[PDB]
Amino acid sequence: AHNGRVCSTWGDFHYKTFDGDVFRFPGLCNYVFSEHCRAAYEDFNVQLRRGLVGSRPVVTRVVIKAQGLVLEASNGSVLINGQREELPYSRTGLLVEQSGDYIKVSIRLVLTFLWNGEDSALLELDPKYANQTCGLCGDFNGLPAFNEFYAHNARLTPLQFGNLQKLDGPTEQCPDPLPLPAGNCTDEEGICHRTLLGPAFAECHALVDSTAYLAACAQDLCRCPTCPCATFVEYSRQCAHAGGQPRNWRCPELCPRTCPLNMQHQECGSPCTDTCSNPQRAQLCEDHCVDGCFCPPGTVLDDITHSGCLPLGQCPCTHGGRTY
Amino acid sequence: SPGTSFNTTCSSCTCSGGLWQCQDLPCPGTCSVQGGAHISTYDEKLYDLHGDCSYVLSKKCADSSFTVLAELRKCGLTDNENCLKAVTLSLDGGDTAIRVQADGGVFLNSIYTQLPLSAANITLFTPSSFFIVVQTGLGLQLLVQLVPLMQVFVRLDPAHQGQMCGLCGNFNQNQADDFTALSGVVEATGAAFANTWKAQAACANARNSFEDPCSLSVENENYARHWCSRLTDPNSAFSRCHSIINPKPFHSNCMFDTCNCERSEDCLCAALSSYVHACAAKGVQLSDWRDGVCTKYMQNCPKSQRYAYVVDACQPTCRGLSEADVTCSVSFVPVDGCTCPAGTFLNDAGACVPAQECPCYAHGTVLA
Amino acid sequence: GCAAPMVYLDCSNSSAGTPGAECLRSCHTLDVGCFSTHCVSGCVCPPGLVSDGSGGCIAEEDCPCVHNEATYKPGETIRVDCNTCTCRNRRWECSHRLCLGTCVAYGDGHFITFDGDRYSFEGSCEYILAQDYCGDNTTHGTFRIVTENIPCGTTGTTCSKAIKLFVESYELILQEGTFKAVARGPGGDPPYKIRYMGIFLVIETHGMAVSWDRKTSVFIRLHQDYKGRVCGLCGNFDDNAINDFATRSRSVVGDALEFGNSWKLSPSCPDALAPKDPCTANPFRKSWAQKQCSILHGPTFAACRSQVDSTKYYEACVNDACACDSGGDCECFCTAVAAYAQACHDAGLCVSWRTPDTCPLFCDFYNPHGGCEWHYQPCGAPCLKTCRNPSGHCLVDLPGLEGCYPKCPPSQPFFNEDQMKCVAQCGCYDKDGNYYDVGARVPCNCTPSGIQC
Amino acid sequence: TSVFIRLHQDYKGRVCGLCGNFDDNAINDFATRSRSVVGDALEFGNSWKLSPSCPDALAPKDPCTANPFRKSWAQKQCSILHGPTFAACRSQVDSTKYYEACVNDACACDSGGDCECFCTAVAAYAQACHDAGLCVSWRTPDTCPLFCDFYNPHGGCEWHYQPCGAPCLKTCRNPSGHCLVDLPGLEGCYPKCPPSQPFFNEDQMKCVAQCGCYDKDGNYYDVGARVPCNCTPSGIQC
């Protein structure tokens, strides 16, 4: 599956490259989050801008440039080639949607960009882009620990590394984040260890190592104590992307989620929600676990009038745009 | 009508025989390095050079009468972000050295020398706050721009035609021979030719660049296009020069610079200034071209001075009106910059006062 | 503190200012003369020898010669244009054979004059590409070449060209993919020869060879005799590219539009207006254009990019792929890249891009039912033992150029252009150049001798 | 850009999607997901989208009307279907709708790649003729050329353009030379593999003597190579 063709950015400036690295980088300018830069002609150029909401680390603007298409996501709005468009916007090879809790831009055979809207942002790239990319997401050569941080045979700190992949505005001179002093807190109550090493992500321990995620959970605990679940969410996403089946870890106290009356909030639900417009879409799907709202088995979704998930034999039909 | 003639700055043509009978007035050649990367040779062979070394910019290669050297240094994350950082006129087989740095400091034999200076027929002076003129008696003349960034212009008395060597080419009115290296064969590309003229063997060879800096950032694209388009606008102030100098290489320079420059305003204004100065070299007086653009170069002027679009000659000094000035009989193409306003003179303190406030100097003695 | 004969040098003992290891006598800096205000400590070859730059030491009479981002040992040879050089004592010694000057006129109006100048002129009327009929006497010239842009299916963007090769009192019209002959003056023997060089019509005149891609590219190669005595849109061939913008009345202008508007054949024709940048007009092609033209920066053209400057060729490619908004796109991109292909061919290289995905060239077409003479060669033979030239010699020996040629076996050793095949014996060409089979009467019969009676 | 699917008569009446339901009843082939036969193409297409989240396609726009300045060129290019090149086939295969398709496609491709559009629009008719009864060979060097000397290495002359290929190919993957669904001739160029090198290899596109090996996933190796067992005359063995 999507073994090592994924990079991510979450929570308190935590960056995860394709090959498995994790590092914190508290930058606050525009950065080349990834880019086709070892090719005669570039295919994609995805950039991030990270900012502050009062104190919360967020992503304020993404600019994906791909094959002559410019896509600027910011302020809860999407600009396609300079024009605002209403979601979803679809064209040959491109589709952008408000699917689930996020904004997902899939440029078929190029990339898959999920953006939760505030802090998370995840890139899936084609296997043919190996070794030809460069940016915070790394080089996609498959070797994590050895080739991202050697600038002319010298090893760099994540602050320096993230500062190399910097890009100022035409009239902007953004500074660099001075190193954060030592940390504190750690996991005193054991919440990170109890959850991450708990039952839910059992098989996730067999695919993705949790050490960096444990550290990030502790570091977020040092930050506000309503925002420690970002690392758990990211670990769920990564475990789902490697191939393993994450299990439900959310409890009414552990960052509770809500879904509509007939829709349940699941970790690892089938991405293709069967809906009696196409009540058998979920037959031979190929896509890993995805989190979001889902329907209890048997009662497919009703996308024709949006009455929630409905039994197969009580949902409407459509003829010529007329509901029956 | 028949009987009429018109003279360009480089030639004169008479309408007769139903044709133009054209003769060539003498023309001092003009090499230049602009943007820190682009080179316009004496034969007008524009080519970009992304190098990190000191390069023999021009040298009368029969002997070592003079050797204008340029040190070009990498200025950014990418290997194609370069700046000119010095201009080292080496003279008399290296016996004399005039080194104009990037901040304006001028060194005579590695000793700081304020300006103007006048010795060994060499005259160093600032026509304005933007330019430094190094007029030598050997035939050439250097004109170095500091504001907004560092650019160099080299002027040759036509007698040296077909004799020089170096980066700027042999000055023989032939664009195909410019890449004739010392091995007797024309090199292929710009950088292949330049990597034969490095000063130090330990330098890193220049490489050929295809990566347009414009393709990287979209806001950089919009900014650079929206401003550098002022070059090719037929309604623009620059338009007057279009019928003489083709502005396409200048537009390409402006695009590349601004899309690549860290202070892209600096490189944008440098490219526009370069086009303006080349046009003034051909004999066109572009004025009032900074409408809503590059005005921070108006405002940053030293106190008691003001900007001037046409500084066509001498800086008016009080000492000079007292006891004349050997500095001030030099013909240079009219450059722009900050200067004392007309009718006013700068005293030895550097401040600008009218003529009535300034003493007359007898034997070098101040006399109110 | 070193191993090779090169020994260490330290500036602590010497007074400041001595030439340090940076001013090391080297195969490059032995010749220029080093400059540095600071000494550096390092390993330096012993006096009498220099360094190769790799820590070795070499006698100064064996320094490798550097050429075009490369390096050649002493005794290695290279080829530049029409002459060959050999590396000796950090110099190149080259033969002194004269090299055929070259004008290029291709694409949407890109011109490379005889003197190496380059510009773009998008005209519509008839324009004199070259002529000797300009001078204090216009009547002592010989030839004249006019061109104008044909639209091949409409009246819009250019799709092909049309050439009018006047050669003394003769005339040839090159259009639609073939030639003609409108000889009006004295009816003697033709002062030209005609050949099918690959994908080109090539016409020799013993001092001037024209090559037409049959769609839109014209490359002319002139002997050194015609130097300075030509004019038109290929310049005046004076090894001085600054003044090549010389109009009809010889008033060198700085603008290409006026230079072109001068050389229109008919004063009644209207002057071309301001050319408009293609990619700005049609941004929705632009991206595709770059993706197509990026072939120049790829490993297909890795080697040549160090032998021929390809900035302007790439700009022309992108502008042409942006401009062709009325149909026939692959042809525009193909010819824009093929001009660079020919430049590489002429410089020193045999480059073969032409992938089945990218600008394919159907050359199996002339293969009859498995007969396999017709093979694609990236660089053709200098002269072809054609039906029209049974001798096998040629007047202007052109170098290799793209196109597919027949490997005419000894059993059928004559290449016949009018049928495009390898055949045993040829027919006959009349004065106008029409072809007939042996034994067929001409409006006299045809025999091994030819047309006889 | 063209897919031609050929099914046995077994699957008659039991398939669906955008190729109809294969029932020898063309009026009702616009049967949507819920089998509500419509008189409109847009609804029938919108039914069979995989992901219901995807937006429905809007009204298709007539290409030649949109971009009139291409139309003339398009017609001049598409007129190849009326010329004597296709004089014979026009009596065996109805070419009205094919010509309309050619003109529409050559009008539509205003963003680049025009020759491919025209080439495939004509090649659909070429395959119609090829299946019907005729080995038509248009494909002139001026019009839709097909580079087939490319796989010819250094004067080797196996690879020739045949307008109708052999019903089965003795490929490297199929050393038997037999085939399951014998397709008739179709355009392209094929190698005339000589007896000395009688195996056509697709992964190198060449006539060679002895073949290598394919694994379960289908990757290829040269003989004498171990697989992530070695490669031998048997193939992958151990």
Ligand SMILES: *[C@@H]1O[C@H](CO)[C@@H](O)[C@H](O)[C@H]1NC(C)=O
């Ligand atoms: C987003 O856009 C809305 C208008 O659409 C604006 O009112 C708001 O301030 C912007 N920012 C946020 C964080 O909502």
Ligand SMILES: *[C@@H]1O[C@H](CO)[C@@H](O)[C@H](O)[C@H]1NC(C)=O
């Ligand atoms: C990846 O790129 C590096 C960069 O030079 C190269 O050395 C290496 O061989 C490449 N490996 C793969 C598997 O692409």
Ligand SMILES: *[C@@H]1O[C@H](CO)[C@@H](O)[C@H](O)[C@H]1NC(C)=O
């Ligand atoms: C240039 O031409 C003008 C107009 O005839 C004339 O007045 C002027 O003297 C000329 N310049 C010379 C001769 O240097």
Ligand SMILES: *[C@@H]1O[C@H](CO)[C@@H](O)[C@H](O)[C@H]1NC(C)=O
């Ligand atoms: C100018 O150059 C001459 C020639 O070498 C030299 O003799 C003289 O000292 C220099 N200075 C002056 C003021 O003439």
Ligand SMILES: [Ca+2]
């Ligand atoms: Ca790596």
Ligand SMILES: [Ca+2]
């Ligand atoms: Ca020259």
Ligand SMILES: [Ca+2]
């Ligand atoms: Ca000339």
Ligand SMILES: [Ca+2]
């Ligand atoms: Ca049916």
